[PDB]
């Protein structure tokens, strides 16, 4: 044929070079994300930074609202993120007409995975580099987190993290859930759910971040919303109201 | 798309792929055609070494292209079916449309034309076959003998020989034919054809297959019995010229 | 294999250069256009008793006013003829009259451009360019007698005389000295025979040469074996009496 | 290496563009010297026709696209024809659809797009030919320079072919004078011949090499061909 | 056209007020003279504050409406919130190319926060017309005089709810193919509030 | 512009081998220990469940998929190749048989349909071939219970027990010795846990085994509690508690 | 594009060969063995399944024996996968001849088509060919019993005893000697089994390492009834010849 | 190194350095599967050394965990292989 | 490393294909163009290089219109920039017909984005080597956007690209701070002209001809128009006053 990394075909070893390099250096773009599940919400915190004072940070987007209710958190670069967004959006909409029902996280995950795989076998396309975390509060499962990753592999989570502070986030939640004997915390108001998230975040990444350095996306039953800049400071001050 | 290159120039103004097509023919079996002025004889090898072949369903080297026209070859059988099929269709196409029996020149142009296409056109390679095409034009008693190469070129020849040891059989034939006095009788032109093809088959008198074409669809394949007789005779001739 | 779009630092394509190499290996074709005709002559060559030498010729008729003699690969000149007949026939039906020899060369040269992988400008269906160059000779009622040299590269020039083939370097040089602007059809044919004799390593017979002519009361006319030989018979004696 | 990025037309290289593209710009200089000049009411094209021999007849270096338009080539011939047909097609359709002649500017921008498409296509190639396209539309007199990678510039005057820089020095001096003569054809024409013979330095000029074409406010596409260029030297 | 029809209440309208636009329609389907559904929904969402009133055949309108839903979800998300003008055009485009097999009479009425309430009327062959308030269906004709006199500027929310209730109740009386429940959707800066009146309510009111 | 790739990416090497099939197989050897047993009173297939994360669902994860109602498949190889392949196998099985002959394809016939997908993909360029091997374990009422192997190229062969993945040969030895036909399904479940304990060490549970059987019926697997008309599924995947119960049963 | 991202192995060689074809025959010479003995009251077919086990089924004895018709069947030497596409298409090519003329295809036509498809994969497309060689076990009323072999190159030859697969060389050297020019089925069966043992290393020749089919005329079975021997009928014939050792 | 084998190496290095009833082996058996005897000894030794440079005298199961997690990676690679997750 | 310098159909370990790097480089190798967002609008200005008096003013402006209210200017290579725009135009005509509304500046960013990104999933199509700064006023506010050649793009408050990118961001960043966003659209022409002047200091081998255009909802009424006449002429003077030399 050609070679195993000038076109996409098996390696000597049965590996795929392109999928493993797609895992690595697409999360080192100054991005770190976590998603945790509420009681009647789903919270995402994700880093999101602007290096100029001349770059309007509103257009800067890496939590997208796929539908009115669906969110998708992308870890990886904006050229890739919009190829996956266009696909996601289209899939969401199509689903809504044809099957008469709102798009579940899991179905979207599964569909996108199989598609990426096909593009992985192709000798004139690449797998996208992006890692896609699809969030809502389904009325067919409660709060949900389902994540696809780039190899055509995808799997459901109850809480997930990405970027190399994966270990830190996990351990804090694991110990906590083993003690309380639940993997979802119980609290109604979204506000208290974001405070729970921050607590585990601050400890784990070992830092706190500004309003414009964060972006927080909240899933609720039949809405997904992003928190304004003042709204993200309100929460950071509110734990410090306690202190 | 697989209309892209698969046949490229040489720097010498040949084509690599046509030079390599001719080699397969040489390794191959030998076919010959020798002309009288009443017939055209075609000899074809059937050198069965092994005795476990059943030879009524072991492929022949003689095809009808038309009822008054034959094609013989030396080269890969697999490729030759593909050419043989397109050439039968073309005889019937003329017959249908012109209301006329087929003329030898046009068929030769056709055989030449498919091979010529596949060198010129991309994502195809030429056939592994050289052919001899012979027959008689309608209402005509003079012999016709054409040679085509998988280059796609074409020529007429009074006699021509192809495949393995082409040199040896040309060289011999050249001493036993003149255009000014070619043979009138079937027996002596056949004697000459069997004698050339003896000298390269090694042992053969059932391994040599003669088919003699007289004007307009009198096409008759001589048998082993008959051939063994000419070989005896040739062994008598070679101690009358000692 | 070899690029189909890759040029030399000068900017002359590899494929074009390679086209020029096959041309130089055929047997000479020589044309002189005069004021009463166009003469096209070829060396057919080969004489054998196992060869039918007067059944093969290199001067083929396109139309009742157009011939071509070739030099180079002969198999290639069959595709060029198939395109050329179709184009001329369709124009005679639409406007009832002769097609121009320059016009024909351009229509053919357009399909000489395909080779290789396709373009988005053009669908390239072939694999190599044509390895034969041609002298196309004709008559039209609006420029009289003419002679044209088509190169497979794309360039076509009108000439009053031109030689192509292996032995063209010598041949052309002779053409100029012999050429003048009161040259006639009958002289030109005799002269052709002189040139052909000179450059042969053999005796000139009509089973190694063929003549042809154009007169406008008969169109493109092949000077037959019987007439060509009578002309050869007359040559040998007259030359062999200047010594 | 050279051989690494050369094989197909789909690769960029650290230079900022592909090697092959530069080789297409280089070919133009090989082919025929053609100068382009305009005043503001007429625009003049002067071209040297070359052949190969004594007994060869000239190849035309002016191809008339319309009865108000024509162009000169310099460089590779076969592409210059494939382009002149496209321009013919573009022209006609404009007239059939929009009743429109086809502006020089308008044509340039369509031609550019066609050129990008054939430089992203891998089997495709740069054309390897530059063109000086002249016209008088209702935009005024025009000269455009077309390059076979999609570079289109509107100019007062320019040259492509043998010592372009050569002619350009001449034109840049005599510029201010000739361009303000507006309403006299002959002067601008006379400046064209005066220029072209000084670019030359290993060739000479003669009557039947030269061919002049003028288009303008009162000159519909007209060629002075052979003999009739004598009266502009 | 197609093959098969379900017939519909054939009295729809959108009337604008101060706080936006209120859309109102009657719903009741029949197949023949058989009452397929007493209670039905003819108020269909294409966007969150932008609904439409479906008229012609049920079948044709649904098939179009799906196509419009699909485009408008993707517009919303990507290009920002739609307008009624944006909807109106999608409805027209399909309708005009497919006028020979579909038949759709649509009033698209929407509430925007950048152009307020908007009414775009799509004719049965397919056209885009803005009008200040619109009446469509085949019972609108009888109620042209009433709506124009009492249609007045800067209406109060109740006064417009009475006005639409009255408009449709006179049309439902005189017209025969009209009947069943009145559904309405009040489209304001406060959301969409949905009202339903059973047969016994509007007749009196 | 656009693709032009039509040249086969699977080609012959000087020995008579096919580079792509050789490569793909290395992946399969390194893949998760899977086996299949025909108990004669059923068929039991077991495969390793795994978790990515403890905070990760493994409900979504697919290690045992039902290809058609009475038939399950399990694999060793490349997970993404497996997922797409299952899909094309499900589709053709439903369209071309389930109201044409009025029932599911027979096991051997379904193994051939998979075989074809993989072979199309090996012949043709634009795409590399599938990198997978399957164990298709089944029941069809016209062949009983069956076990097949499907290779990466699409070569298949019949088996009555096997294992593929890492540590195959020894796994087959324990299975060969313990089972020799005419055996309860339950008993084959017990044997299967024993073969895999010896095969996998470091930590072992029934919460890291995912077990499916084809070898039961419930009324719930006719899919209705009324009056029969047909037989229906016999695929049943067990929950983790039931598997721990069979681990407790000696 | 694809020029420098691909190669051309479907071109000729400086001997006149094609790379992939020559290689394809090699693939076949280490695959399992198929043997064809044509008799004049029958066809005897034998195949060795190289390696058999009690973990494989040995019960399926169509593993290399496929019927393409009730009058033509092939014995396969090479891959199952490669085999599958030509079988399915051959069976289809049958039905077409059958529909058109209401009569079954001769063997020879069906071979010539097969070979043309196989030539085709190296002739255009850039594709790879199959890597499986077929032995045609077949009928005509023009030619009696027929025995062919066709190859991935697409050359095809008439036989009355042939082998392809491994150990070809050993089987054919014994077979040519012990051949009788016209012979009955039962005699063929004795000859075959005798040859078979001494082509299978050490004590290994068993019924369950063999696939056997015979095609007999019968007189409780129809003219040209193909019997594809299932285990138990192999067990019988081995004991009768006594060759089980 | 099989499971009984790794277990010993954690214990033997763990004797040599500070330890307490927190120095939970059960955790560790999941964390390490079959790395050479060289590698297990290397890591256990380094983690006691690294804790003490972070200005901790005590070693706990917590302490080994925080040292390890830092050394093992600094880039993010998603699960294990492409063969199974 | 390698394969990623010729292709885009496979993924670099650096996360950034070497061919993509070369595309950015040709952008910095063009001219300066900039874009200024203001409190009602956007103003665009470009340095047009003067080489010879054989070039004609305002026919080789590098400002090209799309729709009615989007002005598009670029740095890099001319052919890439025009083809990219011609595609924008075609999508824009399609847009207008279908949705009966003008094409957004955010929409157009996406349209361009998807054409570039498409050519960065394929080795068989070669992408664009220009950064295009564009913007306008629409139904949903004023927008400045910059499209970079990866298929990365965002909305900015201010933008520069080209040779003079750095000097331009400096001079812009001071002026934007001083103002709330860039004050009035009138003011913005004067400000622009200062930015071009500072950006010229990286050229100094060619003279320049100043060309500005604007799109303003308070002094153009939502249309893209050139800034010429009096307004351009006061702007040359303002630049030459404060910036000396």
UniProtKB/Swiss-Prot annotation, chain A:
Keyword annotations of the record: Acetylation, Cytoplasm, Isopeptide bond, Nucleus, Phosphoprotein, Proteasome, Ubl conjugation
Biological process per Gene Ontology, one example term: proteasome-mediated ubiquitin-dependent protein catabolic process
GO cellular component: mitochondrion; nucleus; proteasome complex; proteasome core complex, alpha-subunit complex
Phosphoserine modifications at: 228
Pfam families membership: Proteasome, Proteasome_A_N
Main location: cytoplasm
Glycyl lysine isopeptide (Lys-Gly) (interchain with G-Cter in ubiquitin) cross-link, chain position(s): 223
InterPro entries: Ntn_hydrolases_N (IPR029055), Proteasome_alpha (IPR050115), Proteasome_alpha-type (IPR023332), Proteasome_asu_N (IPR000426), Proteasome_sua/b (IPR001353), Proteasome_subunit_alpha6 (IPR034642)
Gene3D superfamilies assigned: Glutamine Phosphoribosylpyrophosphate, subunit 1, domain 1 (3.60.20.10)
Superkingdom of origin organism: Eukaryota
Location in the cell: Cytoplasm; Nucleus
PANTHER family hit by this protein: PROTEASOME SUBUNIT ALPHA/BETA (PTHR11599)
Note: Present with 15200 molecules/cell in log phase SD medium.
Family of the protein in this entry: Belongs to the peptidase T1A family.
Function: The proteasome degrades poly-ubiquitinated proteins in the cytoplasm and in the nucleus. It is essential for the regulated turnover of proteins and for the removal of misfolded proteins. The proteasome is a multicatalytic proteinase complex that is characterized by its ability to cleave peptides with Arg, Phe, Tyr, Leu, and Glu adjacent to the leaving group at neutral or slightly basic pH. It has an ATP-dependent proteolytic activity.
Protein name: Proteasome subunit alpha type-1
Curated annotation (Swiss-Prot), chain E:
GO molecular function, one term: endopeptidase activity
GO cellular component: cytosol; nucleus; proteasome complex; proteasome core complex, beta-subunit complex; proteasome storage granule
Gene3D superfamilies noted in UniProt: Glutamine Phosphoribosylpyrophosphate, subunit 1, domain 1
PROSITE patterns according to UniProt: PROTEASOME_BETA_1, PROTEASOME_BETA_2
Catalytic activity: Cleavage of peptide bonds with very broad specificity
CDD domains the record matches: proteasome_beta_type_6
PANTHER family named in the record: ATP-DEPENDENT PROTEASE SUBUNIT HSLV (PTHR32194:SF0), METALLOPROTEASE TLDD (PTHR32194)
Name assigned to this protein: Proteasome subunit beta type-1
Species name: Saccharomyces cerevisiae (strain ATCC 204508 / S288c) (Baker's yeast)
Gene label: PRE3
Swiss-Prot record, chain H:
Superkingdom: Eukaryota
Signal peptide: none
UniProt subcellular location: Cytoplasm; Nucleus
Function text: The 26S proteasome is involved in the ATP-dependent degradation of ubiquitinated proteins. The regulatory (or ATPase) complex confers ATP dependency and substrate specificity to the 26S complex.
Family, per entry: Belongs to the AAA ATPase family.
Name listed for the protein in its UniProt record: 26S proteasome regulatory subunit 6B homolog
Post-translational modification: N-acetylated by NAT3.
Source taxonomy: Eukaryota, Fungi, Dikarya, Ascomycota, Saccharomycotina
Organism: Saccharomyces cerevisiae (strain ATCC 204508 / S288c)
From Swiss-Prot, chain I:
Gene Ontology terms: cellular component: nucleus; proteasome complex; proteasome core complex, alpha-subunit complex; proteasome storage granule
Post-translational modification summary for this protein: The alpha and beta forms are probably products of the same gene with different post-translational modifications.
GO terms for biological process, alphabetical: proteasomal ubiquitin-independent protein catabolic process; proteasome-mediated ubiquitin-dependent protein catabolic process
Keywords: Acetylation, Cytoplasm, Nucleus, Proteasome
Subcellular location: Cytoplasm; Nucleus
Primary residence: cytoplasm
Cystine pairings recorded for this chain: none
GO MF entries: mRNA binding
Function in brief: The proteasome degrades poly-ubiquitinated proteins in the cytoplasm and in the nucleus. It is essential for the regulated turnover of proteins and for the removal of misfolded proteins. The proteasome is a multicatalytic proteinase complex that is characterized by its ability to cleave peptides with Arg, Phe, Tyr, Leu, and Glu adjacent to the leaving group at neutral or slightly basic pH. It has an ATP-dependent proteolytic activity.
Additional facts recorded: Present with 12000 molecules/cell in log phase SD medium.
Family statement drawn from the similarity comment of this UniProt entry: Belongs to the peptidase T1A family.
Name this protein carries in UniProt: Probable proteasome subunit alpha type-7
Taxonomic lineage from the root: Eukaryota, Fungi, Dikarya, Ascomycota, Saccharomycotina
Gene: PRE10
């Amino acid at each position: 044929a050609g070679y195993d990394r000038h076109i996409t075909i098996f390696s000597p070893e049965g590996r795929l070079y392109q999928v493993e390099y797609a895992f690595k250096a697409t999360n080192q773009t100054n991005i770190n994300s976590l998603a945790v599940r509420g009681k009647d919400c789903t919270v995402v915190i994700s880093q999101k930074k602007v290096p100029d004072k001349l770059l309007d940070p509103t257009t800067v987007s890496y939590i997208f609202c796929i539908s009115r209710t669906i969110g998708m958190v992308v870890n990886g670069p904006i050229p890739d993120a919009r190829n996956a967004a266009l696909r996601a959006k289209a899939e969401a909409a199509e689903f809504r007409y044809k099957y008469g029902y709102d798009m579940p996280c899991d179905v979207l995950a599964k569909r996108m995975a199989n598609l990426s795989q096909i593009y992985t076998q192709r000798a004139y396309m690449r797998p996208l580099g992006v890692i896609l975390t699809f969030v809502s509060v389904d009325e067919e499962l409660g709060p949900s987190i389902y994540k696809t990753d780039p190899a055509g592999y995808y799997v459901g989570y109850k809480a997930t993290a990405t970027g190399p502070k994966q270990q830190e986030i996990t351990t804090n939640l694991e110990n906590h859930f083993k003690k309380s004997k639940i993997d979802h915390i119980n609290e109604e108001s979204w506000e208290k759910v974001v405070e729970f998230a921050i607590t585990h975040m601050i400890d784990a990444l070992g830092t706190e971040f500004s309003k414009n350095d964060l972006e927080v996306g909240v899933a609720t039953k039949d809405k997904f919303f992003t928190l304004s800049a003042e709204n993200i400071e309100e929460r950071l001050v509110a734990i410090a109201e306690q202190d | 798309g697989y209309d892209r290159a698969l046949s490229i120039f040489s720097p010498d103004g040949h084509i690599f792929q046509v030079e390599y097509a001719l080699e397969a023919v040489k390794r191959g079996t030998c076919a010959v055609g020798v002309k009288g002025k009443n017939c055209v004889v075609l000899g074809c090898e059937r050198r069965s070494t092994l005795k476990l072949q059943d030879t009524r369903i072991t492929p022949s080297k003689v095809s009808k292209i038309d009822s008054h026209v034959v094609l013989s070859f030396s080269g890969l059988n697999a490729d030759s079916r593909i050419l043989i099929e397109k050439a039968r269709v073309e005889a019937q196409s003329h017959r249908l449309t012109l209301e006329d029996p087929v003329t030898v020149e046009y068929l030769t142009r056709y055989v030449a034309g498919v091979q010529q296409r596949y060198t010129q056109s991309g994502g195809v390679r030429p056939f592994g076959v050289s052919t001899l095409i012979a027959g008689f034009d309608p209402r005509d008693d003079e012999p016709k003998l054409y040679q085509t190469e998988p280059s796609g070129i074409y020529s007429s020849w009074s006699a021509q020989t192809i495949g393995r040891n082409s040199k040896t059989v040309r060289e011999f034939l050249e001493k036993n034919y003149d255009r000014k006095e070619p043979p009138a009788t079937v027996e002596e032109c056949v004697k000459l054809t069997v004698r050339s093809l003896l000298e390269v088959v090694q042992t053969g008198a059932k391994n040599i297959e003669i088919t003699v074409v007289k004007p307009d669809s009198d096409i008759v394949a001589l048998s082993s019995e008959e051939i063994n007789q000419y070989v005896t005779q040739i062994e008598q001739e070679k101690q009358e010229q000692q | 294999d070899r690029g189909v779009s890759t040029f030399s630092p000068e900017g002359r394509l590899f494929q074009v250069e390679y086209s020029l190499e096959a041309i130089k290996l055929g047997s000479t074709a020589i044309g002189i256009a005069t004021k009463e005709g166009v003469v096209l002559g070829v060396e057919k060559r080969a004489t054998s008793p196992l060869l039918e030498s007067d059944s093969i010729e290199k001067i083929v008729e396109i139309d009742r006013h157009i011939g071509c003699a070739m030099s180079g690969l002969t198999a290639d000149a069959r595709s060029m003829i198939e395109h050329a007949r179709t184009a001329a026939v369709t124009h005679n039906l639409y406007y009832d009259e002769d097609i121009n020899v320059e016009s024909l060369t351009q229509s053919v040269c357009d399909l000489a451009l395909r080779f290789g992988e396709g373009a988005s400008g053009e669908e390239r269906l072939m694999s190599r360019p044509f390895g034969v160059a041609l002298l196309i000779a004709g008559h039209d009622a609006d420029d009289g007698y003419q002679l044209f040299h088509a190169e497979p590269s794309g360039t076509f020039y009108r000439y009053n005389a031109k030689a192509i083939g292996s032995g063209s370097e010598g041949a052309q040089a002779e053409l100029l000295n012999e050429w003048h602007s009161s040259l006639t059809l009958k002289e030109a044919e005799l002269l052709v025979l002189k040139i052909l004799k000179q450059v042969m390593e053999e005796k000139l017979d009509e089973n190694n040469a063929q003549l042809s002519c154009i007169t406008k009361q008969d169109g493109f006319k092949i000077y037959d074996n019987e007439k060509t030989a009578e002309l050869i018979k007359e040559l040998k004696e007259k030359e062999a009496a200047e010594s | 290496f050279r051989n690494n990025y050369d094989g197909d037309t789909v690769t960029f290289s650290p230079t900022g563009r592909l090697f092959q593209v530069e080789y297409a710009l280089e070919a133009i200089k090989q082919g025929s010297v053609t100068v382009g000049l305009r005043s503001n009411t007429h625009a003049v094209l002067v071209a040297l026709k070359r052949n190969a021999d004594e007994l060869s007849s000239y190849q035309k270096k002016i191809i008339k696209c319309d009865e108000h338009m024509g162009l000169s080539l310099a460089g590779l011939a076969p592409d210059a024809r494939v382009l002149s047909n496209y321009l013919r097609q573009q022209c006609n359709y404009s007239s059939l659809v929009f009743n429109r002649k086809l502006a020089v500017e308008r044509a340039g921008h369509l031609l550019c797009d066609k050129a990008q498409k054939n430089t992203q296509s891998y089997g495709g190639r740069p054309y390897g030919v530059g063109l000086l396209i002249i016209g008088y539309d209702k935009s005024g007199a025009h000269l455009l320079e077309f390059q076979p990678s999609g570079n289109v510039t509107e100019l007062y005057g320019t040259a492509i072919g043998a010592r372009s820089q050569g002619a350009k020095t001449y034109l840049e001096r005599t510029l201010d004078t000739f361009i303000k003569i507006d309403g006299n054809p002959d002067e601008l024409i006379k400046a064209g011949v005066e220029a072209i013979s000084q670019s030359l330095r290993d060739e000479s000029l003669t009557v039947d090499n030269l061919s002049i074409a003028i288009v303008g406010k009162d000159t519909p596409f007209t060629i002075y061909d052979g003999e009739a260029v004598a009266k502009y030297i | 056209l197609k093959k098969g029809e379900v017939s519909l209440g054939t009295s729809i309208m959108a009337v604008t007020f101060k706080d936006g636009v209120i859309l109102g329609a009657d719903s009741r389907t029949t197949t023949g003279a058989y009452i397929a559904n007493r209670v039905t929904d003819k108020l269909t969402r294409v966007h969150d504050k932008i609904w439409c009133c479906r008229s012609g055949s049920a079948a044709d309108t649904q098939a179009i409406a799906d196509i419009v839903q699909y485009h408008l979800e993707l517009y919303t998300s990507q290009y920002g919130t739609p307008s009624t003008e944006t909807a109106a055009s999608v409805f027209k485009e399909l309708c005009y190319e497919n006028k020979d097999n579909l038949t759709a009479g649509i009033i698209v009425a929407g509430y925007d926060d950048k152009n307020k309430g908007e009414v775009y009327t799509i004719p049965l062959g397919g056209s885009v017309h803005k009008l200040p308030y619109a009446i469509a269906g085949s019972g609108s004709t009888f109620i042209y005089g009433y709506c124009d006199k009492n249609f007045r500027e800067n209406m109060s929310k109740e006064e417009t709810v009475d006005f639409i209730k009255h408009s449709l109740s006179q049309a439902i009386k005189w017209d025969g193919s009209s009947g069943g429940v009145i559904r309405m959707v009040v489209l304001t800066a406060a959301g969409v509030e949905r009202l339903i009146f059973y047969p016994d309510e509007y007749e009196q009111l | 512009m656009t693709d032009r790739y039509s040249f086969s990416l699977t080609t012959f090497s000087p020995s008579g081998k096919l580079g792509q099939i050789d490569y793909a197989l290395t992946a399969v050897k390194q893949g998760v220990t899977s086996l299949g047993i025909k108990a004669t009173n059923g068929v039991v297939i077991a495969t390793e469940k795994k978790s990515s994360s403890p905070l990760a669902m493994s409900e979504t994860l697919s290690k045992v998929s039902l290809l058609t109602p009475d038939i399950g498949a399990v694999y060793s190889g490349m997970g993404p190749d497996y997922r797409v392949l299952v899909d094309k196998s499900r589709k053709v099985a439903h369209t071309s048989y389930k109201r044409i002959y009025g029932e599911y394809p027979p096991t051997k016939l379904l193994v051939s349909e998979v075989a074809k997908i993989m072979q199309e993909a090996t012949q043709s360029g634009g795409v590399r071939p599938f990198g997978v091997s399957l164990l298709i374990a089944g029941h069809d009422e016209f062949n009983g219970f069956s076990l097949y192997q499907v290779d990466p190229s699409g070569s298949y062969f019949p088996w009555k027990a096997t294992a593929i993945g890492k540590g195959s040969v020894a796994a087959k030895t324990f299975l060969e010795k313990r089972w020799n036909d005419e055996l309860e399904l339950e008993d084959a479940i017990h044997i299967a846990l024993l073969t895999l304990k010896e095969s996998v060490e470091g930590e072992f549970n029934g919460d890291t085994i995912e077990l499916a059987i084809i070898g039961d019926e419930n009324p719930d697997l006719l899919g209705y509690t009324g009056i029969p008309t047909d037989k229906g599924p016999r695929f049943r995947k067990l929950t983790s508690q039931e598997i721990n119960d069979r681990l407790e049963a000696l | 594009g694809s020029r420098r991202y691909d190669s051309r192995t479907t071109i000729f060689s400086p001997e006149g060969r094609l790379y992939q074809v020559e290689y394809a025959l090699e693939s076949i010479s280490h695959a399992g063995t198929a043997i064809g003995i044509m008799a004049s009251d029958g066809i005897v077919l034998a195949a060795e399944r190289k390696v058999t086990s009690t973990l494989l089924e040995q019960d399926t004895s169509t593993e290399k024996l496929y019927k393409l018709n009730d009058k033509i069947a092939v014995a396969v030497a090479g891959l199952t996968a490669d085999a599958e596409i030509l079988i399915n298409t051959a069976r289809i090519h049958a039905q077409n001849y059958l529909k058109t003329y209401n009569e079954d295809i001769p063997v020879e036509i069906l071979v010539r088509r097969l070979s043309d498809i196989k030539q085709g994969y190296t002739q255009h497309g850039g594709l790879r060919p199959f890597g499986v060689s077929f032995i045609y076990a077949g009928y005509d009323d023009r030619y009696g019993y027929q025995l062919y072999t066709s190859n991935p190159s697409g050359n095809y030859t008439g036989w009355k005893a042939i082998s392809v697969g491994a150990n070809t060389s050993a089987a054919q050297t014994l077979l040519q000697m012990d051949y009788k020019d016209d012979m009955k089925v039962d005699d063929a069966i004795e000859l075959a089994l005798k040859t078979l043992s001494k082509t299978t290393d050490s004590s290994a020749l068993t019924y369950d390492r063999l696939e056997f089919a015979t095609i007999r005329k019968g007189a409780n079975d129809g003219e040209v009834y193909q019997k594809i021997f299932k285990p138990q009928e192999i067990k019988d014939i081995l004991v009768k010849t006594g060759i089980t050792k | 190194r099989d499971r009984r084998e790794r277990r010993l190496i954690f214990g033997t290095i763990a004797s040599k350095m500070s330890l307490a009833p927190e120095a939970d082996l059960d955790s560790l058996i999941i964390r390490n599967d079959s790395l050479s005897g060289a590698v297990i000894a290397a890591i256990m030794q380094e983690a006691g050394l690294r804790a003490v440079r972070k200005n901790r005298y005590v070693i706990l199961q917590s302490d080994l965990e925080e040292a390890y997690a830092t050394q093992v990676k600094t880039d993010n690679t998603v699960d294990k292989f492409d063969f199974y997750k | 490393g390698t394969g990623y310098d010729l292709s885009n159909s496979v993924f670099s370990p650096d996360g950034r294909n070497f061919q993509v790097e070369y595309a950015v480089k040709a952008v910095e190798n063009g001219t300066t163009s900039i874009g200024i967002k203001c409190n009602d609008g956007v103003v665009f200005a470009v340095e047009k290089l003067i080489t010879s008096k054989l070039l004609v003013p305002q026919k080789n402006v590098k400002i090209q219109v799309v729709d009615r209210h989007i002005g598009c200017v670029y740095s890099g290579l001319i052919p890439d920039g025009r083809h990219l725009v011609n595609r924008g135009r075609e999508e824009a005509a399609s847009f207008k017909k279908l949705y009966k509304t003008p094409i957004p500046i955010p929409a157009f960013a996406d349209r361009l984005g998807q054409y570039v990104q498409a050519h960065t999933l394929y080795n068989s199509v070669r992408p664009f080597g220009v950064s295009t700064i564009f913007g306008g006023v629409d139904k949903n506010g004023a927008h400045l956007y910059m499209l970079e050649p990866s298929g990365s793009y965002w909305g900015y408050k201010g933008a520069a690209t080209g040779k003079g990118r750095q000097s331009a961001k400096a001079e812009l960043e001071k002026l934007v701070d001083h103002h709330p966003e860039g004050l009035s659209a009138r003011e913005a022409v004067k400000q622009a002209a200062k930015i071009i002047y500072l950006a010229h200091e990286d050229n100094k081998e060619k003279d320049f001809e100043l060309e500005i255009s604007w799109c303003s909802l308070s002094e153009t009424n939502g249309l893209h128009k050139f800034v010429k006449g009096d307004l351009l002429q006061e702007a040359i003077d303002f630049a030459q006053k404060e910036i000396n030399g």
